[model samples]
Target: APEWPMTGCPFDPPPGVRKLLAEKPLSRARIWDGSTPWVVTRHADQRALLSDPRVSHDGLRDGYPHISADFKFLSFAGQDDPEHGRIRRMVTLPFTARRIEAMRPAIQKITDELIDGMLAGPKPVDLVEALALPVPVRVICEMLGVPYEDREFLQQNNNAMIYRDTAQGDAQKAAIAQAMYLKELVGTKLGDDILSDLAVQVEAGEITQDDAAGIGMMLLGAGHETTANMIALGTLALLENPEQLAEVRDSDDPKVIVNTVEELLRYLTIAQDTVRRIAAEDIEIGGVVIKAGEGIVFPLNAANWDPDLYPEAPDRLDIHRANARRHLAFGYGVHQCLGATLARVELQIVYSTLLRRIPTLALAGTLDEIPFKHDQIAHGVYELPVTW
Candidate 1:
């Protein structure tokens, strides 16, 4: 059975994955826990199964695929409807379209401040540390009432918890520490952040303190690191493709930045190994029978790069593509990413501002020397050393 391939073009899916896409839409692949789960590779099939009622996200179910020990702690994405819907609703208000749109001015302010700091401080800086990581970290921190001062500590703990090479015990400990920290904040009921609101739910007997903490942990983890990676990695990608970078920087139309971010999300698909589900009832998809209880893995890259959808050159980076916005970078169906709108807004600000401000920005290190987070479930660079 196929396993997650180690080597491939940094920007593309693993070579084995492309091979799988060419062969058939669905097949079996061996996962971390020794289960041969069904892998869905095509774009259409993924959208279909992800929206289907028979396919479930309950990770606690028998034979369900668990990617890593750290992943076992996921609460919101792993629960089935009713329960999942309830827990998700608690945190959804802050990320709704109106709420996120209201946050644009604040997002731009944070991005500008970070860029100002980067410009004043030094050259050949690690973009990840200087700008990429800080933008989303600050935004999410503000939302959760988590202190901006604790961003570094929380980001480090999040890295340890999500990276594949991290020791199981260490990851578990880091996760516990995060939950404890959030639980303490929820206990305080001090601020207007999401945690304080969750505390209100606890008071109303709508949710346990533990459940609120779990939601906090999920938001903290999802809200920061993924967008952080996009900022850094997307910057790196644009720098490598100078003409594309020029197009982004010179274009007066806001649509250029909008489409550029979506294209980058499609090309990169940073949440590399997620979108795990199981068949709750026997269902046929892509001419394959996914029996009840069988695991299903939806490889976003394969779907994003589907020749049928992106007919021109699925692997190439094209910011101007019309269908780019339709990509699966933010999964599909009811369980799709909660923070994607915020992410798009942040990237729009950062990418446009950073590129325009520092037109000469170039890689400070050789491509091979820049450490890619291949060992991590969320793909990104550890540090993007750059000089302008």
Candidate 2:
């Protein structure tokens, strides 16, 4: 089979991926490293396999698919079982739903301030820069107790580090530099945020410099980028469908707005085929047996577009799509995003608030001109220029 091709259009998944979605429920496909991974396309199959104990997210597993040799990093996200659960426990405190909801007032305050600045300052502004990037950055910074002033420095490295190919050598350099930055920051003034919590972990027993850096940078860069992308990309998706756009902007009912977020999350499903896993034992899924020591790639976009769930033109954006929240966009089982609640809350506030405030908001330039991140782990636009 041919290697997965980049999408001809930014709005759609690559032609190859759509074909995979239309093919059998699960089949083999060529990846970057010449390994033929069992690409799980069906939403039902993805859920079944991901939750199975036999399947492992551990990147160091013998047969696990690695994006590249130089693409090396390990954290609780890539570890399986006891270690993963153990390391993840420390950071889980602040990311809980109760903790996240408490920040709503602060999140709303930041959203209003950003929007206020957008309306008063300039005719056309890059929404990605002005609002999209800051909403999550500030939230994450506040959560981690990282100094908000250093957002751009971390963001710059994050953009480079997220690219699928690591941007030649620059990506690895950025990753290392960002890790170093976190290491240095953690050593000094630790506040009440997650990092400060990490400081306690270090003092108590075993959280070393490497451990602190991994957890801190993981939440900092990964959390910020995903939320930021959804804000920018989901807005673009809504703008394409005026009726759906209106559904969100004009809705006074909180329930309506919340459902709209689910719909957008399902439709966008920003993280593409990057959710990699390997089988530690034989498992049957959708009539196929994935034997032990096999690799799997669950391209989330295909599953979200599965007609079995989203019957009404899955390609089209629908704010009322009933099963939208069932999307595997956040992954399925144990590794399902720790940052899921945080990402959703940020996007929910940004989307509704931005539209309600700037009902006349519009594209500053043609869609063709705005570059989409085809090669990034998180699929989105590089810059979204908009005008009120």
Error of 2 at 385 (Å): 1.7
Worst 10 residues of 2 by lDDT: 66-75
What is the TM-score (0 to 1) of candidate 1?
0.93
| Superposition error at 229 for model 1 (Å) | 1.3
Residue 329 accuracy (lDDT) in model 1:
92
Question: Given candidate 2, what's the lDDT at residue 252?
Answer: 74
> What's the TM-score of each model vs. the native?
0.93, 0.92
- lDDT by residue for model 1 over 87-138, one digit each (tens)? 8888888988888888888888888888899899888899988888778867
Cα shift from native, residue 201, model 1 (Å): 1.2
- Where does candidate 1 clash, by residue pair? none
